[PDB]
Amino acid sequence: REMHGKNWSKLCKDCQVIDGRNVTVTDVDIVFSKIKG
Amino acid sequence: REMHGKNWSKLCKDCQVIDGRNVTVTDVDIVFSKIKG
Amino acid sequence: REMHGKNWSKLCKDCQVIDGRNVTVTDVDIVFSKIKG
Amino acid sequence: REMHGKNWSKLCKDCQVIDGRNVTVTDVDIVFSKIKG
Amino acid sequence: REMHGKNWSKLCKDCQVIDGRNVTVTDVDIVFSKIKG
Amino acid sequence: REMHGKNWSKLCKDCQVIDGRNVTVTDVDIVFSKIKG
């Protein structure tokens, strides 16, 4: 709940990422899904 | 709930990202979905 | 709820992003969706 | 030297092609080059 | 030297192709080169 | 020198191809080269 990230960093919570230089997604139904109740 | 990110950083909460230099998405049904109740 | 991001940063909450230099999206049904109840 | 191609065809000589439905080229120096002497 | 290709065909000579539905080229120096003397 | 290819075919001579549905090329120096003398 207190995130402190200095030069050139990366942090997350509950995150979903596809980090990276050359990214390619093809021929997909769904990429990100969430549900609650 | 208190995020402190100095020069050249990245932080998130509940985030969903596709970070990156050359990004390509093709032939997709859905890319981001959320539901609550 | 208190986000403090100095020079050249990125932060978010509940965010959904497609950050990146060369971005291309093609032949898609939906890109961003949300629902509540 | 005599090419006869009926409905819905493709033919070539000395050809260089990038045929196709969804085409994407990115971050390239050269795509087509020829030299003679 | 006499090519006869009926409906829905493909033929070539000396050809160089990248046929196909979803085509992606990225981060390349050269894609097609020829030299003679 | 006489190529006869009916519906839904493929033929070539001296050809160089990358046929196929989902094609991806990445981080390449050269893809096609020829030399003569």
Residues ≥6 apart with Cβ < 8 Å to A32: A16, B16, B31, B32, B33, C16
Q: Where are the beta strands (DSSP E) in F1-37?
A: 2-5, 16-17, 22-28
| C18 residue type, one letter | I
Contact A23, F27 (CB under 8 A): no
DSSP state of F12: -
Alpha-carbon span F20 to A23, nearest angstrom? 20
- Picking from C2, A22, C13, E6, the residue whose alpha carbon sits closest to that of residue B23 is A22
The residue in chain F having the minimum alpha-carbon distance to the alpha carbon of residue E1 is: F1
Partners of E29 in beta bridges: none
Tokens encoding C31 = 């890109």
Instruction: Count CB atoms within 10 A of the CB of residue E20.
Output: 21
Tokens encoding F12 = 């070539």
Elucidated via: cryo-EM
* Residue A24 sits at the chain F interface (C-beta within 8 Å): yes
- Chains A and E form CB pairs within 8 A to the count of 7
A6 CA to chain E: closest CA distance, Å?
A: 30
| C17 residue type, one letter | V
Contact C1, B1 (CB under 8 A): yes
B31 CA to chain D: closest CA distance, Å?
A: 18
Rounding to the nearest 10 degrees, give the CA dihedral for residues B7, B12, B15, B16: 40
Residues ≥6 apart with Cβ < 8 Å to A27: B26, B27, B28, E22, F22
- What letters, b where the CB count within 10 A reaches 16 and e where it falls short, cover A2-35? ebebeeeebbbeebbbbeeebbbbbeeeebbeee
Q: Nearest 5°: CA angle at B3, between B2 and B9?
A: 175
Partners of C28 in beta bridges: B28
Q: Do C27 and D24 touch (CB under 8 A)?
A: no
Tokens encoding A8 = 């050139």
Contact A9, C10 (CB under 8 A): no
D6 CA to chain C: closest CA distance, Å?
A: 30
Tokens encoding C8 = 């050249």
The separation between CA D2 and the C-alpha centre of its own chain, rounded to angstroms, equals 19
Q: What is the DSSP string of chain A?
A: -EEEE-SS--EEES-EE---SEEEEEEES-S------
The separation between CA D13 and the C-alpha centre of its own chain, rounded to angstroms, equals 9
- Which of E4, E15, E18, E35 is most worth mutating to test chain F (most F CB atoms within 10 A of its CB)? E18
CA distances from C21 to A31, B20, E5 (A): 20, 7, 44
* Residue F7 sits at the chain A interface (C-beta within 8 Å): no
CA distances from A24 to A21, B13, C18, D13, D27 (A): 10, 24, 12, 33, 14
